[PDB]
Amino acid sequence: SWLQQDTGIPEEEQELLQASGLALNSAQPLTQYVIDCTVGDLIFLFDNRKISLPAHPESVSIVLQDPKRPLTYTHLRRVWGQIWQTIRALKEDCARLLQGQRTSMVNLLRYNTELSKKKNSMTSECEQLKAKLDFFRSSIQIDLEKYSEQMEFGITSEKLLSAWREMEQAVELCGREREVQALVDKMMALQTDSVDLQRNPTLDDLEEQARDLYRRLRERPRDQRTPGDSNDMVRLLILAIQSFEKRVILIYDQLSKTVVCKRKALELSPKVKEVMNLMREDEKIVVRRQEKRQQELWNLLKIACSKVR
Amino acid sequence: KVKEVMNLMREDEKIVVRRQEKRQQELWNLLKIACSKVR
Amino acid sequence: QTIRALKEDCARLLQGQRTSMVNLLRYNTELSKKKNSMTSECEQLKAK
């Protein structure tokens, strides 16, 4: 409630994910989920399609420094210190949104593999019923090939040669297999796309470089202070915006991508689950009627035989 | 193992389903007996 | 320099390995997946 209270995306679109391990076990009260202070955190999503967004803190002194560079008294010891801290406040930040993603696509990478491998047994069940449907391209052709060895009797009926003709080719094209692509194709969609993101990528280099500048200034031994340059301590900030800013599209682009896959792996499941229920029996019954189609060659014998005795 | 041992698998199931064509051959030939012996 | 001569060194024996098991990881996957079709066949020739 009080989460929608502020965001407004209400419970039925609310993904509360304690750590990356789990979803929110609303069992316990909220104080099992606390932990603070002394030697982890409920990220939270929206149920939709993706759009990034750089939202930024400030601090006055800083925000003047950069539209400037002139006066530079003794004490950059604040301002300088400050500037990396905000550079460091960005690495702190960018890599918490890298958190979000690489929990929400280590829920995909789960219920991709875990479900959509077992359903790639339900479609080994297809390539048996296919090649097996084939003994039955012989069975009911080889037969229909020697009932033309009949002009020297047994041959009447013709209904049990026309009824073969009609079921020659009723079944000749019965095996619904060609799912073999919407099986494999849209299977390899997600065991290659959930492998691009399970991998993953100079912000961190820049703050190691704003490390020294905002250190070498305090290391600048005794008398030099004054010489007042706001300076390239704005360079190392300007950059440490872009390389933050840009590591937050890439992140968001790539959170989106791992809901793209979530959906597809919830559609490309019950198709190649249920549609391959049908595959089975409505090939399997449509090869239970072949026993009863020799039944009647085998019954055709006990005709041209009771009519001699 | 699971190369050669599955060479054998194929054939010593596959020949052991090449003899089924010749097991109807001779039900289907059993017809052209109890039929030439009436004409 | 000798501390640095060791990182130079260690990340040389870590070399050895992670070339000799990126020859395994090859001719594991590459051969022993195709031979896991030769044993989808078994389960066709069975039900068949």
mmCIF file of C-alpha atoms in Angstrom:
data_model
loop_
_atom_site.group_PDB
_atom_site.id
_atom_site.type_symbol
_atom_site.label_atom_id
_atom_site.label_comp_id
_atom_site.label_asym_id
_atom_site.label_seq_id
_atom_site.Cartn_x
_atom_site.Cartn_y
_atom_site.Cartn_z
ATOM 1 C CA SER A 1 0.000 0.000 0.000
ATOM 2 C CA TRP A 2 2.353 2.637 1.180
ATOM 3 C CA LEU A 3 4.564 1.685 -1.826
ATOM 4 C CA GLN A 4 1.834 2.429 -4.302
ATOM 5 C CA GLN A 5 1.029 5.251 -1.977
ATOM 6 C CA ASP A 6 4.111 6.956 -3.291
ATOM 7 C CA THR A 7 4.667 5.238 -6.707
ATOM 8 C CA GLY A 8 1.089 4.389 -7.543
ATOM 9 C CA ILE A 9 1.839 1.176 -9.397
ATOM 10 C CA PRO A 10 -0.491 -0.871 -7.032
ATOM 11 C CA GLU A 11 0.057 -4.422 -5.581
ATOM 12 C CA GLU A 12 -1.139 -6.246 -8.704
ATOM 13 C CA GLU A 13 1.960 -5.133 -10.644
ATOM 14 C CA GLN A 14 4.357 -5.171 -7.725
ATOM 15 C CA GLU A 15 7.464 -7.276 -7.813
ATOM 16 C CA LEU A 16 9.085 -7.219 -4.419
ATOM 17 C CA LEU A 17 12.323 -9.179 -4.577
ATOM 18 C CA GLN A 18 14.265 -9.456 -1.316
ATOM 19 C CA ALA A 19 17.919 -9.847 -2.320
ATOM 20 C CA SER A 20 18.199 -11.546 -5.667
ATOM 21 C CA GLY A 21 17.394 -14.764 -3.840
ATOM 22 C CA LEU A 22 13.598 -15.073 -3.788
ATOM 23 C CA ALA A 23 10.503 -13.055 -3.966
ATOM 24 C CA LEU A 24 8.938 -11.501 -0.868
ATOM 25 C CA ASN A 25 7.795 -14.097 1.637
ATOM 26 C CA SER A 26 5.013 -11.944 3.177
ATOM 27 C CA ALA A 27 5.084 -14.556 5.936
ATOM 28 C CA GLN A 28 7.383 -12.797 8.421
ATOM 29 C CA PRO A 29 6.845 -9.217 9.684
ATOM 30 C CA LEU A 30 9.018 -6.486 8.033
ATOM 31 C CA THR A 31 11.721 -6.630 10.686
ATOM 32 C CA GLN A 32 13.215 -9.852 9.393
ATOM 33 C CA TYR A 33 13.977 -7.913 6.240
ATOM 34 C CA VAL A 34 15.678 -5.027 8.117
ATOM 35 C CA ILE A 35 19.472 -5.523 8.740
ATOM 36 C CA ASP A 36 21.540 -2.279 9.069
ATOM 37 C CA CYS A 37 24.734 -0.786 10.403
ATOM 38 C CA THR A 38 27.260 -3.502 11.235
ATOM 39 C CA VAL A 39 29.488 -6.294 9.659
ATOM 40 C CA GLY A 40 21.256 -6.885 0.342
ATOM 41 C CA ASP A 41 18.019 -4.948 -0.329
ATOM 42 C CA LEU A 42 14.448 -5.274 -1.724
ATOM 43 C CA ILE A 43 14.608 -4.084 -5.309
ATOM 44 C CA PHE A 44 11.138 -3.828 -6.875
ATOM 45 C CA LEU A 45 9.446 -3.831 -10.335
ATOM 46 C CA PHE A 46 6.411 -2.766 -12.344
ATOM 47 C CA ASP A 47 4.869 -5.534 -14.597
ATOM 48 C CA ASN A 48 5.301 -3.846 -18.069
ATOM 49 C CA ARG A 49 7.345 -3.075 -21.176
ATOM 50 C CA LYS A 50 10.659 -1.388 -20.041
ATOM 51 C CA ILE A 51 12.835 3.678 -20.158
ATOM 52 C CA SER A 52 15.968 4.580 -18.151
ATOM 53 C CA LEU A 53 16.266 7.988 -16.402
ATOM 54 C CA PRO A 54 19.257 9.874 -14.847
ATOM 55 C CA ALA A 55 17.865 11.596 -11.689
ATOM 56 C CA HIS A 56 20.637 13.546 -9.881
ATOM 57 C CA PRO A 57 21.657 14.935 -6.427
ATOM 58 C CA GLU A 58 23.790 18.254 -6.227
ATOM 59 C CA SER A 59 25.545 20.440 -3.517
ATOM 60 C CA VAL A 60 25.898 24.174 -4.126
ATOM 61 C CA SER A 61 29.660 24.777 -4.135
ATOM 62 C CA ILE A 62 30.069 22.044 -6.731
ATOM 63 C CA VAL A 63 27.359 23.340 -9.074
ATOM 64 C CA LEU A 64 29.256 26.651 -9.290
ATOM 65 C CA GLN A 65 32.688 25.180 -9.764
ATOM 66 C CA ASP A 66 31.889 23.813 -13.165
ATOM 67 C CA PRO A 67 30.148 26.768 -14.623
ATOM 68 C CA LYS A 68 33.469 28.428 -13.475
ATOM 69 C CA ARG A 69 37.157 28.078 -12.570
ATOM 70 C CA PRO A 70 38.500 31.412 -11.114
ATOM 71 C CA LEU A 71 38.885 32.063 -7.372
ATOM 72 C CA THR A 72 40.379 29.030 -5.775
ATOM 73 C CA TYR A 73 41.339 29.742 -2.240
ATOM 74 C CA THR A 74 43.401 27.477 -0.009
ATOM 75 C CA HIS A 75 40.484 25.175 0.369
ATOM 76 C CA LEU A 76 39.619 22.937 -2.333
ATOM 77 C CA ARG A 77 40.051 20.513 0.522
ATOM 78 C CA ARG A 78 36.271 20.740 0.775
ATOM 79 C CA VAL A 79 35.293 21.302 -2.752
ATOM 80 C CA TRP A 80 37.743 18.792 -4.187
ATOM 81 C CA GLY A 81 36.971 16.136 -1.553
ATOM 82 C CA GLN A 82 33.318 16.841 -2.430
ATOM 83 C CA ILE A 83 33.696 16.308 -6.151
ATOM 84 C CA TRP A 84 35.023 12.774 -5.915
ATOM 85 C CA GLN A 85 32.553 11.951 -3.202
ATOM 86 C CA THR A 86 29.845 12.615 -5.817
ATOM 87 C CA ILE A 87 31.804 10.807 -8.427
ATOM 88 C CA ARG A 88 31.878 7.974 -5.788
ATOM 89 C CA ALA A 89 28.212 8.557 -5.081
ATOM 90 C CA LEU A 90 27.617 7.576 -8.687
ATOM 91 C CA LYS A 91 29.450 4.280 -8.756
ATOM 92 C CA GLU A 92 27.452 3.604 -5.538
ATOM 93 C CA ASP A 93 24.388 4.434 -7.594
ATOM 94 C CA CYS A 94 24.968 2.932 -11.111
ATOM 95 C CA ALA A 95 25.990 -0.365 -9.561
ATOM 96 C CA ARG A 96 22.558 -0.498 -7.449
ATOM 97 C CA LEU A 97 20.607 -0.382 -10.707
ATOM 98 C CA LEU A 98 22.942 -3.014 -12.032
ATOM 99 C CA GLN A 99 21.571 -4.772 -9.020
ATOM 100 C CA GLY A 100 17.937 -4.610 -10.113
ATOM 101 C CA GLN A 101 18.711 -6.127 -13.516
ATOM 102 C CA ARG A 102 21.008 -8.878 -12.480
ATOM 103 C CA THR A 103 18.395 -10.141 -10.073
ATOM 104 C CA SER A 104 15.417 -9.918 -12.536
ATOM 105 C CA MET A 105 17.357 -11.823 -15.161
ATOM 106 C CA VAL A 106 18.586 -14.342 -12.649
ATOM 107 C CA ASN A 107 14.953 -15.100 -12.291
ATOM 108 C CA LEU A 108 14.581 -15.441 -16.088
ATOM 109 C CA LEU A 109 17.763 -17.533 -16.437
ATOM 110 C CA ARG A 110 16.065 -19.744 -13.877
ATOM 111 C CA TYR A 111 12.584 -20.287 -15.257
ATOM 112 C CA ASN A 112 14.016 -20.365 -18.695
ATOM 113 C CA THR A 113 16.379 -23.308 -18.190
ATOM 114 C CA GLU A 114 14.364 -25.041 -15.484
ATOM 115 C CA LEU A 115 11.044 -25.207 -17.303
ATOM 116 C CA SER A 116 12.182 -24.874 -20.913
ATOM 117 C CA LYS A 117 14.502 -27.855 -20.875
ATOM 118 C CA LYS A 118 12.023 -30.341 -19.508
ATOM 119 C CA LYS A 119 9.683 -29.190 -22.258
ATOM 120 C CA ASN A 120 12.483 -30.175 -24.610
ATOM 121 C CA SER A 121 11.793 -33.774 -23.676
ATOM 122 C CA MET A 122 8.116 -33.304 -24.508
ATOM 123 C CA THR A 123 9.547 -32.662 -27.938
ATOM 124 C CA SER A 124 11.837 -35.656 -28.094
ATOM 125 C CA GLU A 125 8.556 -37.476 -27.641
ATOM 126 C CA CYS A 126 7.816 -35.973 -31.206
ATOM 127 C CA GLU A 127 10.814 -37.299 -33.069
ATOM 128 C CA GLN A 128 10.045 -40.839 -31.980
ATOM 129 C CA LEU A 129 6.388 -40.656 -32.941
ATOM 130 C CA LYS A 130 7.616 -39.388 -36.299
ATOM 131 C CA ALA A 131 10.152 -41.997 -37.352
ATOM 132 C CA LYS A 132 7.731 -44.488 -35.650
ATOM 133 C CA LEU A 133 4.838 -43.190 -37.741
ATOM 134 C CA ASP A 134 7.150 -44.422 -40.547
ATOM 135 C CA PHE A 135 7.279 -48.199 -40.124
ATOM 136 C CA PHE A 136 3.698 -47.345 -40.940
ATOM 137 C CA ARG A 137 4.547 -45.819 -44.241
ATOM 138 C CA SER A 138 5.926 -49.218 -45.083
ATOM 139 C CA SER A 139 3.268 -51.429 -43.330
ATOM 140 C CA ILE A 140 0.381 -49.783 -45.210
ATOM 141 C CA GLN A 141 2.203 -49.317 -48.467
ATOM 142 C CA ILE A 142 3.915 -52.805 -48.687
ATOM 143 C CA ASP A 143 0.461 -54.226 -48.073
ATOM 144 C CA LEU A 144 -1.224 -51.976 -50.603
ATOM 145 C CA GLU A 145 1.587 -53.065 -52.929
ATOM 146 C CA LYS A 146 0.765 -56.744 -52.773
ATOM 147 C CA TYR A 147 -3.043 -56.406 -52.886
ATOM 148 C CA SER A 148 -2.231 -55.595 -56.469
ATOM 149 C CA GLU A 149 -0.710 -59.091 -56.515
ATOM 150 C CA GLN A 150 -4.401 -60.005 -56.525
ATOM 151 C CA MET A 151 -6.127 -60.941 -59.740
ATOM 152 C CA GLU A 152 -6.008 -64.647 -58.820
ATOM 153 C CA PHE A 153 -8.670 -64.207 -56.069
ATOM 154 C CA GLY A 154 -9.202 -62.801 -52.555
ATOM 155 C CA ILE A 155 -9.499 -59.526 -54.466
ATOM 156 C CA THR A 156 -13.257 -58.593 -54.326
ATOM 157 C CA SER A 157 -14.468 -55.814 -51.887
ATOM 158 C CA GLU A 158 -12.296 -52.990 -53.400
ATOM 159 C CA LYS A 159 -13.712 -51.032 -50.445
ATOM 160 C CA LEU A 160 -10.796 -52.561 -48.485
ATOM 161 C CA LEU A 161 -8.469 -51.146 -51.128
ATOM 162 C CA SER A 162 -10.227 -47.837 -51.471
ATOM 163 C CA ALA A 163 -10.443 -47.545 -47.653
ATOM 164 C CA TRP A 164 -6.736 -48.218 -47.645
ATOM 165 C CA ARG A 165 -6.310 -45.591 -50.383
ATOM 166 C CA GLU A 166 -8.130 -43.027 -48.266
ATOM 167 C CA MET A 167 -6.093 -43.926 -45.191
ATOM 168 C CA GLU A 168 -2.968 -44.492 -47.184
ATOM 169 C CA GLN A 169 -2.984 -40.693 -47.243
ATOM 170 C CA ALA A 170 -5.205 -39.748 -44.330
ATOM 171 C CA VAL A 171 -2.223 -40.710 -42.153
ATOM 172 C CA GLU A 172 0.476 -40.088 -44.836
ATOM 173 C CA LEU A 173 0.486 -36.491 -43.622
ATOM 174 C CA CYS A 174 -0.696 -36.754 -39.987
ATOM 175 C CA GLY A 175 2.453 -36.329 -37.989
ATOM 176 C CA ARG A 176 2.392 -32.742 -36.752
ATOM 177 C CA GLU A 177 6.146 -32.399 -36.376
ATOM 178 C CA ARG A 178 7.033 -29.169 -38.098
ATOM 179 C CA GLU A 179 6.704 -27.640 -34.628
ATOM 180 C CA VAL A 180 10.370 -28.711 -34.607
ATOM 181 C CA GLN A 181 11.252 -25.044 -35.348
ATOM 182 C CA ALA A 182 8.806 -23.115 -33.042
ATOM 183 C CA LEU A 183 10.245 -25.713 -30.678
ATOM 184 C CA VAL A 184 13.989 -25.174 -31.451
ATOM 185 C CA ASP A 185 13.864 -21.654 -32.947
ATOM 186 C CA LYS A 186 11.998 -19.987 -30.071
ATOM 187 C CA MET A 187 13.949 -22.202 -27.664
ATOM 188 C CA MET A 188 17.316 -20.946 -28.865
ATOM 189 C CA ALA A 189 15.886 -17.434 -28.593
ATOM 190 C CA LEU A 190 16.252 -17.588 -24.809
ATOM 191 C CA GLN A 191 19.207 -19.920 -24.186
ATOM 192 C CA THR A 192 21.269 -17.425 -26.153
ATOM 193 C CA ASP A 193 19.545 -14.219 -25.092
ATOM 194 C CA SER A 194 19.598 -15.099 -21.391
ATOM 195 C CA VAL A 195 23.308 -15.776 -21.960
ATOM 196 C CA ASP A 196 24.057 -12.265 -23.239
ATOM 197 C CA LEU A 197 22.833 -10.755 -20.054
ATOM 198 C CA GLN A 198 24.136 -13.383 -17.606
ATOM 199 C CA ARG A 199 27.538 -12.113 -18.830
ATOM 200 C CA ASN A 200 27.659 -8.280 -18.606
ATOM 201 C CA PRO A 201 29.685 -5.086 -18.401
ATOM 202 C CA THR A 202 35.671 3.585 -16.918
ATOM 203 C CA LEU A 203 33.313 5.031 -14.414
ATOM 204 C CA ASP A 204 35.281 3.023 -11.868
ATOM 205 C CA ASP A 205 38.557 3.998 -13.485
ATOM 206 C CA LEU A 206 37.569 7.693 -13.366
ATOM 207 C CA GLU A 207 36.871 7.594 -9.650
ATOM 208 C CA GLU A 208 40.221 5.942 -9.066
ATOM 209 C CA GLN A 209 41.647 8.931 -10.971
ATOM 210 C CA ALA A 210 39.592 11.434 -9.073
ATOM 211 C CA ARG A 211 40.951 9.397 -6.149
ATOM 212 C CA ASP A 212 44.449 10.735 -6.523
ATOM 213 C CA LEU A 213 43.731 14.220 -7.684
ATOM 214 C CA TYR A 214 41.597 14.746 -4.558
ATOM 215 C CA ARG A 215 44.406 13.009 -2.643
ATOM 216 C CA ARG A 216 47.509 14.509 -4.297
ATOM 217 C CA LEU A 217 46.078 17.922 -3.338
ATOM 218 C CA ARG A 218 46.084 16.984 0.332
ATOM 219 C CA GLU A 219 49.430 15.336 -0.250
ATOM 220 C CA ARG A 220 50.788 18.605 -1.809
ATOM 221 C CA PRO A 221 53.292 19.077 1.013
ATOM 222 C CA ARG A 222 53.142 22.280 3.053
ATOM 223 C CA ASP A 223 53.461 25.631 1.214
ATOM 224 C CA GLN A 224 51.898 25.837 -2.248
ATOM 225 C CA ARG A 225 48.259 26.006 -1.400
ATOM 226 C CA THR A 226 46.689 29.185 -2.923
ATOM 227 C CA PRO A 227 47.310 28.917 -6.714
ATOM 228 C CA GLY A 228 43.573 28.675 -7.347
ATOM 229 C CA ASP A 229 42.443 26.270 -10.049
ATOM 230 C CA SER A 230 38.838 24.984 -9.952
ATOM 231 C CA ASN A 231 39.873 23.115 -12.964
ATOM 232 C CA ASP A 232 40.162 19.584 -14.311
ATOM 233 C CA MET A 233 38.495 18.601 -11.123
ATOM 234 C CA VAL A 234 35.563 19.515 -13.158
ATOM 235 C CA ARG A 235 36.910 17.490 -16.092
ATOM 236 C CA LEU A 236 36.850 14.356 -13.920
ATOM 237 C CA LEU A 237 33.291 15.216 -12.989
ATOM 238 C CA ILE A 238 31.882 16.025 -16.420
ATOM 239 C CA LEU A 239 33.132 12.642 -17.628
ATOM 240 C CA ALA A 240 31.915 10.870 -14.493
ATOM 241 C CA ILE A 241 28.451 12.067 -15.473
ATOM 242 C CA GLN A 242 28.446 10.728 -19.043
ATOM 243 C CA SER A 243 29.978 7.423 -18.133
ATOM 244 C CA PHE A 244 27.379 7.247 -15.322
ATOM 245 C CA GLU A 245 24.537 8.516 -17.485
ATOM 246 C CA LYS A 246 25.469 6.000 -20.210
ATOM 247 C CA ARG A 247 25.943 3.109 -17.832
ATOM 248 C CA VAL A 248 22.325 3.783 -16.937
ATOM 249 C CA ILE A 249 20.885 3.541 -20.402
ATOM 250 C CA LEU A 250 22.797 0.373 -21.010
ATOM 251 C CA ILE A 251 21.466 -0.920 -17.737
ATOM 252 C CA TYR A 252 17.871 0.083 -18.445
ATOM 253 C CA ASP A 253 18.010 -1.105 -22.062
ATOM 254 C CA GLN A 254 19.177 -4.242 -20.680
ATOM 255 C CA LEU A 255 16.580 -4.556 -17.901
ATOM 256 C CA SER A 256 13.944 -4.220 -20.583
ATOM 257 C CA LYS A 257 15.581 -6.956 -22.566
ATOM 258 C CA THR A 258 15.127 -9.321 -19.612
ATOM 259 C CA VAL A 259 11.395 -8.752 -19.463
ATOM 260 C CA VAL A 260 11.221 -9.206 -23.297
ATOM 261 C CA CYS A 261 12.346 -12.716 -22.527
ATOM 262 C CA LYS A 262 10.165 -13.330 -19.478
ATOM 263 C CA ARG A 263 7.032 -12.827 -21.635
ATOM 264 C CA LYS A 264 8.226 -14.879 -24.576
ATOM 265 C CA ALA A 265 9.174 -17.658 -22.131
ATOM 266 C CA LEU A 266 5.612 -17.609 -20.798
ATOM 267 C CA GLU A 267 3.999 -17.848 -24.256
ATOM 268 C CA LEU A 268 6.472 -20.148 -25.917
ATOM 269 C CA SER A 269 5.773 -22.493 -23.060
ATOM 270 C CA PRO A 270 2.127 -23.558 -23.016
ATOM 271 C CA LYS A 271 2.149 -23.842 -26.841
ATOM 272 C CA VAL A 272 4.963 -26.331 -26.914
ATOM 273 C CA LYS A 273 3.447 -27.972 -23.832
ATOM 274 C CA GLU A 274 -0.243 -28.382 -24.651
ATOM 275 C CA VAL A 275 0.088 -28.277 -28.462
ATOM 276 C CA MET A 276 2.415 -31.292 -27.938
ATOM 277 C CA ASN A 277 -0.089 -33.025 -25.787
ATOM 278 C CA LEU A 278 -2.210 -33.117 -28.959
ATOM 279 C CA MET A 279 0.768 -34.109 -31.061
ATOM 280 C CA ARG A 280 1.078 -37.262 -28.942
ATOM 281 C CA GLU A 281 -2.332 -38.839 -28.830
ATOM 282 C CA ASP A 282 -3.492 -37.447 -32.186
ATOM 283 C CA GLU A 283 -0.675 -39.235 -33.714
ATOM 284 C CA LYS A 284 -0.770 -42.136 -31.256
ATOM 285 C CA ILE A 285 -4.463 -42.999 -31.759
ATOM 286 C CA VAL A 286 -3.846 -42.221 -35.414
ATOM 287 C CA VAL A 287 -1.505 -45.257 -35.202
ATOM 288 C CA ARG A 288 -3.770 -47.413 -33.073
ATOM 289 C CA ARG A 289 -6.005 -47.770 -36.099
ATOM 290 C CA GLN A 290 -3.269 -49.599 -38.068
ATOM 291 C CA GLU A 291 -3.510 -52.672 -35.999
ATOM 292 C CA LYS A 292 -7.144 -52.709 -37.032
ATOM 293 C CA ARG A 293 -6.152 -52.202 -40.686
ATOM 294 C CA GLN A 294 -4.184 -55.386 -40.761
ATOM 295 C CA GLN A 295 -7.101 -56.590 -38.691
ATOM 296 C CA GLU A 296 -8.980 -56.526 -41.893
ATOM 297 C CA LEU A 297 -6.316 -57.945 -44.249
ATOM 298 C CA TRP A 298 -6.051 -60.624 -41.634
ATOM 299 C CA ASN A 299 -9.891 -60.864 -41.670
ATOM 300 C CA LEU A 300 -9.865 -60.791 -45.498
ATOM 301 C CA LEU A 301 -7.997 -64.145 -45.098
ATOM 302 C CA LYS A 302 -10.791 -65.724 -43.069
ATOM 303 C CA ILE A 303 -13.116 -64.967 -46.035
ATOM 304 C CA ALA A 304 -11.292 -66.366 -49.091
ATOM 305 C CA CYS A 305 -10.947 -69.339 -46.657
ATOM 306 C CA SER A 306 -14.372 -69.937 -45.139
ATOM 307 C CA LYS A 307 -15.475 -69.864 -48.798
ATOM 308 C CA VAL A 308 -13.645 -73.096 -49.712
ATOM 309 C CA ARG A 309 -14.360 -75.197 -46.670
ATOM 310 C CA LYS B 1 31.228 -46.117 -26.048
ATOM 311 C CA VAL B 2 28.340 -43.819 -26.850
ATOM 312 C CA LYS B 3 29.612 -43.720 -30.473
ATOM 313 C CA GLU B 4 30.247 -47.349 -31.396
ATOM 314 C CA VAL B 5 27.904 -48.934 -28.799
ATOM 315 C CA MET B 6 25.227 -46.801 -30.517
ATOM 316 C CA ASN B 7 26.233 -48.020 -33.908
ATOM 317 C CA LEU B 8 25.081 -51.442 -32.636
ATOM 318 C CA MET B 9 21.984 -49.920 -31.058
ATOM 319 C CA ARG B 10 20.877 -48.741 -34.512
ATOM 320 C CA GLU B 11 21.318 -51.689 -36.463
ATOM 321 C CA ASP B 12 20.499 -54.380 -33.907
ATOM 322 C CA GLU B 13 17.234 -52.781 -33.478
ATOM 323 C CA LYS B 14 16.972 -51.595 -37.097
ATOM 324 C CA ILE B 15 17.559 -55.017 -38.708
ATOM 325 C CA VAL B 16 15.453 -56.388 -35.859
ATOM 326 C CA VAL B 17 12.687 -54.305 -37.512
ATOM 327 C CA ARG B 18 13.572 -55.148 -41.095
ATOM 328 C CA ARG B 19 12.274 -58.617 -40.443
ATOM 329 C CA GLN B 20 8.728 -57.314 -39.823
ATOM 330 C CA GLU B 21 8.170 -56.466 -43.394
ATOM 331 C CA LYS B 22 8.929 -60.117 -44.074
ATOM 332 C CA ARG B 23 6.497 -61.185 -41.287
ATOM 333 C CA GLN B 24 3.557 -59.657 -42.995
ATOM 334 C CA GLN B 25 5.060 -60.703 -46.290
ATOM 335 C CA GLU B 26 4.130 -64.151 -45.210
ATOM 336 C CA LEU B 27 0.697 -63.485 -43.677
ATOM 337 C CA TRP B 28 0.064 -61.669 -46.908
ATOM 338 C CA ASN B 29 1.497 -64.740 -48.761
ATOM 339 C CA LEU B 30 -0.563 -67.064 -46.510
ATOM 340 C CA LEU B 31 -3.546 -65.338 -48.205
ATOM 341 C CA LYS B 32 -2.406 -66.308 -51.687
ATOM 342 C CA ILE B 33 -2.504 -69.957 -50.476
ATOM 343 C CA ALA B 34 -5.939 -70.364 -48.917
ATOM 344 C CA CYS B 35 -6.921 -68.616 -52.196
ATOM 345 C CA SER B 36 -5.087 -70.414 -54.990
ATOM 346 C CA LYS B 37 -6.575 -73.528 -53.336
ATOM 347 C CA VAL B 38 -10.184 -72.632 -54.223
ATOM 348 C CA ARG B 39 -9.735 -71.334 -57.730
ATOM 349 C CA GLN C 1 59.654 -5.489 -8.652
ATOM 350 C CA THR C 2 59.822 -9.101 -7.386
ATOM 351 C CA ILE C 3 56.303 -8.806 -5.966
ATOM 352 C CA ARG C 4 55.477 -7.656 -9.585
ATOM 353 C CA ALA C 5 57.621 -10.444 -11.003
ATOM 354 C CA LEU C 6 55.208 -12.811 -9.265
ATOM 355 C CA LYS C 7 51.933 -11.467 -10.648
ATOM 356 C CA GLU C 8 53.807 -11.656 -14.017
ATOM 357 C CA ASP C 9 54.466 -15.296 -13.093
ATOM 358 C CA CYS C 10 51.281 -16.619 -11.416
ATOM 359 C CA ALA C 11 49.131 -15.156 -14.164
ATOM 360 C CA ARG C 12 51.314 -17.364 -16.321
ATOM 361 C CA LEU C 13 50.447 -20.723 -14.753
ATOM 362 C CA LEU C 14 46.846 -19.613 -14.675
ATOM 363 C CA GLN C 15 47.587 -19.265 -18.325
ATOM 364 C CA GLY C 16 48.537 -22.921 -18.875
ATOM 365 C CA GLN C 17 45.320 -24.179 -17.285
ATOM 366 C CA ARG C 18 42.845 -21.853 -18.833
ATOM 367 C CA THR C 19 44.125 -22.834 -22.262
ATOM 368 C CA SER C 20 44.176 -26.648 -21.605
ATOM 369 C CA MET C 21 40.611 -26.548 -20.309
ATOM 370 C CA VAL C 22 39.487 -24.303 -23.140
ATOM 371 C CA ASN C 23 40.504 -27.223 -25.246
ATOM 372 C CA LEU C 24 38.441 -29.582 -23.055
ATOM 373 C CA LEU C 25 35.416 -27.221 -22.961
ATOM 374 C CA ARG C 26 35.689 -27.414 -26.719
ATOM 375 C CA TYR C 27 35.905 -31.128 -27.467
ATOM 376 C CA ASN C 28 33.532 -31.751 -24.674
ATOM 377 C CA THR C 29 30.612 -29.672 -25.988
ATOM 378 C CA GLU C 30 31.466 -30.031 -29.687
ATOM 379 C CA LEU C 31 31.662 -33.817 -29.843
ATOM 380 C CA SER C 32 29.605 -34.776 -26.756
ATOM 381 C CA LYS C 33 26.458 -32.994 -27.797
ATOM 382 C CA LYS C 34 26.210 -34.484 -31.242
ATOM 383 C CA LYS C 35 26.572 -37.865 -29.565
ATOM 384 C CA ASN C 36 23.541 -36.815 -27.560
ATOM 385 C CA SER C 37 21.518 -37.122 -30.730
ATOM 386 C CA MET C 38 22.863 -40.625 -31.284
ATOM 387 C CA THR C 39 21.041 -41.225 -28.039
ATOM 388 C CA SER C 40 17.791 -39.563 -28.979
ATOM 389 C CA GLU C 41 17.872 -42.174 -31.720
ATOM 390 C CA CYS C 42 18.009 -44.911 -29.200
ATOM 391 C CA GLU C 43 14.748 -43.649 -27.837
ATOM 392 C CA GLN C 44 13.149 -43.607 -31.275
ATOM 393 C CA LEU C 45 14.299 -47.095 -32.169
ATOM 394 C CA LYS C 46 12.813 -48.134 -28.838
ATOM 395 C CA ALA C 47 9.310 -46.759 -28.988
ATOM 396 C CA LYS C 48 9.505 -47.661 -32.725
#
